[PDB]
């Protein structure tokens, strides 16, 4: 889906949407395309262990340094372990192999840290296969998060704005600096235009999706 996302972003950025004669950004809004899943908190502990994260349904996950993943569902008991080749296993906290005790303990450490310290992004949105974090990286400006359902999320450090790109819907959700959450069809952004701030962030997103492709 990354190449589809790249093509969608190219088409919208090529149209120079902030130069529309009259920009009508609101006409591009499509609340039906609001994503089900996004990353609502995260902690990069990759100097030792890896990247812990919360999804907006309050499930939590870790992408460990060895490229395995452990997901704890929002019931607090169901687990999914994903090996580095994508092989999935389904377990529980109450019945799991002893070989996973260290990673379960680490996941619990991340879950508790994020609960005690970090603000939930998108908490104002009222509530599908649960995705896992496929890969991530940071730049000077942002963290880029690639989920296994094809979504790409980009969180900008300076001003707290966020994009959630969904190539299946050809849509982008933008959370602005006031924490207002709006979802747009990319083709309608091409038609109706958008403000310079969003246009600028969609240009940066194309660059970031390009880096993911490699």
């Amino acid at each position: 889906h990354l190449s589809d996302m790249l093509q969608q972003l190219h088409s919208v950025n090529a149209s120079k949407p902030s130069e529309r004669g009259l920009v009508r950004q609101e006409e591009a809004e499509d609340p039906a395309c609001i994503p089900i899943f996004w990353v609502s908190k995260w902690v990069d502990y990759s100097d030792k262990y890896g990247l812990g994260y919360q999804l907006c349904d309050n499930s939590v996950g870790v992408l460990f340094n060895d490229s395995t993943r452990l997901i704890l569902y929002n019931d607090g008991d169901s687990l999914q372990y994903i090996e580095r080749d994508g092989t999935e296993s389904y377990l529980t906290v109450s019945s799991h192999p002893n070989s996973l005790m260290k990673k379960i303990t680490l996941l619990k450490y991340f879950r508790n840290y994020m609960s005690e310290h970090l603000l939930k992004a998108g908490a104002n949105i009222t509530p599908a296969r649960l995705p896992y974090l496929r890969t991530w990286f940071r730049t000077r400006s942002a963290i880029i998060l690639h989920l296994s359902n094809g979504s790409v999320q980009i969180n900008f450090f300076q001003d707290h704005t966020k994009l959630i790109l969904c190539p299946l819907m050809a849509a982008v959700t933008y959370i602005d600096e006031k924490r207002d959450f709006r979802t747009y069809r990319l083709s309608l952004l091409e038609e109706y235009g958008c403000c310079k701030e969003l246009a600028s962030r969609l240009r940066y997103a194309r660059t970031m999706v390009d880096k993911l492709l490699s």
């Binding site: 995260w42 902690v43 990069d44 994020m114 310290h117 970090l118 603000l119 992004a121 969180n155 707290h160």
Partner: peptide
């Protein structure tokens, strides 16, 4: 880390 509460 993401942002603080």
């Amino acid at each position: 880390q993401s942002t603080x509460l």
